[PDB]
Design a protein around this ligand. Structure first.
Ligand SMILES: C[S@@+](CC[C@H](N)C(=O)[O-])C[C@H]1O[C@@H](n2cnc3c(N)ncnc32)[C@H](O)[C@@H]1O
Ligand SMILES: [Zn+2]
Length: 262
């Protein structure tokens, strides 16, 4: 019911687990137990045995254990609008960072039928392609079905963007989001990072993370604003990974290029 509990349990935080205990107490009329009965995150919860659940909660552990197994068997369907917004947030983050890091002069947006830039304030020439452009944006979209066998010698300037545009094989100069390996041989998996160049502001649980690429993290003292934004971005990113999307990137992508922007 709480949005985080619609993620796969491996994504649950320690607070998410506690909210799970409360949701389950109401849903199954269980004896209330201390919010600290399972002080761990979901990754840890999944390593417990059923005996551990029974020892930890004599009155309800077996039920909680079986509930978790039911959740792992029938994963919660996500909300389509929330997942769309999440994926869009990630798209903007990732493409903004790529352009800042490598200063591509042209972006080839392949599989974009609406001619909408995810990063409209970047200094880059944006070009759109789609096999079936929306008829109200086709005037500025190249009608093109991409196949590596036909186009691998094209679009070699700048960077290519394939945001959920499933082609036979991506070219090496690509940013890719794919929903569920030979399509990806020219690329590498893209690890999580958060980048921001917005002003730092101090007015939380201090954020410690090597993947918060902000000016205030150069010295390890993340400001409250970026702590907040990092955590919101991580929630959006978890919701897109938990739904089956994965990110891939051109092999030269380097987060130190982002640090150097400061
Ligand atoms: C999930 S939709 C929209 C993807 C878009 N990049 C986005 O972020 O919303 C997939 C799009 O890719 C187009 N498409 C699928 N295969 C394609 C291909 N091989 N070459 C060009 N466009 C393709 C479809 O016509 C459609 O507009
Ligand atoms: Zn900051």
């Amino acid at each position: 019911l709480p949005a985080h509990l619609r993620l796969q349990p491996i994504y649950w935080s320690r607070d998410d687990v506690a909210q799970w205990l409360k949701w389950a107490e109401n849903e199954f009329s269980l004896r209330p137990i201390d919010s600290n009965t399972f002080e761990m995150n979901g990754k840890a919860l999944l390593l417990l045995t059923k005996e551990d659940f029974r020892y930890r909660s004599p009155h309800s552990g077996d039920e909680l254990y079986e509930l978790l197994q039911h959740i792992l068997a029938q994963p919660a369907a996500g909300d389509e609008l929330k997942i769309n917004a999440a994926c869009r947030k990630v798209q903007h983050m990732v493409v903004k960072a790529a352009l800042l890091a490598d200063k591509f002069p042209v972006l080839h947006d392949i599989g974009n039928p609406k001619a909408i830039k995810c990063v409209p304030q970047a200094d880059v020439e944006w070009k759109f392609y789609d096999a079936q452009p929306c008829s109200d944006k086709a005037y500025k979209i190249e009608e093109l079905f991409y196949s590596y066998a036909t186009h691998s010698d094209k679009f070699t300037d700048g960077v290519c963007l394939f945001w959920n545009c499933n082609v036979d094989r991506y070219p090496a100069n690509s940013i890719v989001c794919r929903f569920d390996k030979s399509a990806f041989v020219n690329l590498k998996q893209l690890p999580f990072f958060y980048y921001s160049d917005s002003p730092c502001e101090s007015h939380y649980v201090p954020l410690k993370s090597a993947t918060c690429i902000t000016r205030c993290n150069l010295g390890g003292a993340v400001c409250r604003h970026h702590a907040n934004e990092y955590r919101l971005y991580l929630d959006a990113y978890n919701m897109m990974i938990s739904a089956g999307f994965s990110l891939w990137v051109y092999k030269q992508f380097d987060t130190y290029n982002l640090w150097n922007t400061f």
